[PDB]
Structure 1
């Protein structure tokens, strides 16, 4: 059966404006394994996104970690956008340093 991806976005280090950091997008609980993941800066696709090898959990659902270098500022937004056969519309989750 099809399972919808969960998406969590979080920084590697405490966010400090103007300091290089790494932004993580962890995508879990999906089936089938095929998936497209984009990371976005101010709504534009970020070109250098690295991704772990996909694997799966004990419940058989798949997961993968995407990550990118970023330098947070007061005004830049960042998001992770995922396309998966389980939903007609891509799903977007924004980084929110306060959450």
Structure 2
């Protein structure tokens, strides 16, 4: 029996167009621990994405923080795509500036 990852995509600081920032992809509530996480800009894989070490919570499920440096603009689209055995296809979650 497997647990499906919950995902949040969000900036470290309130985003201001033109100002360097960090985009986070926080992935939780998954088991088994093997997982594949990509961050995407305008549909294309972002090359330098850093990954926290993986940890787990008292319910046994794993969690990890992926992050990358970015400078937001009015029109650039960002997403986090997650591949896990609990899901039949990879899940893509889009960054919403307001969330």
Is the TM-score greater than 0.5?
yes
TM-score band by shorter chain is over 0.9
Q: What displacement does 1:33 show? A: 0.3
Moved over 3 A (4+): none
TM value normalised by structure 2: 0.98
Q: Which runs of 5+ in 2 are unaligned?
A: none
Residue equivalent to 1:32 = 32
- Cα distance in 2 for partners of 1:71, 1:77 equals 11
- Cα distance in 2 for partners of 1:87, 1:24 equals 21
Residue equivalent to 1:15 = 15
Helix, strand or coil at the partner of 2:10: strand
Paired positions, count: 99
Helix, strand or coil at the partner of 1:89: coil
Report Cα offsets for 1:22-61 as digits up to 9, x if no partner.
0000000000000000000000000000000001001000
Q: Which runs of 5+ in 1 are unaligned?
A: none
Helix, strand or coil at the partner of 2:38: strand
- Cα distance in 2 for partners of 1:29, 1:13 equals 24
Q: What displacement does 1:14 show? A: 1.0
Residue equivalent to 2:95 = 95
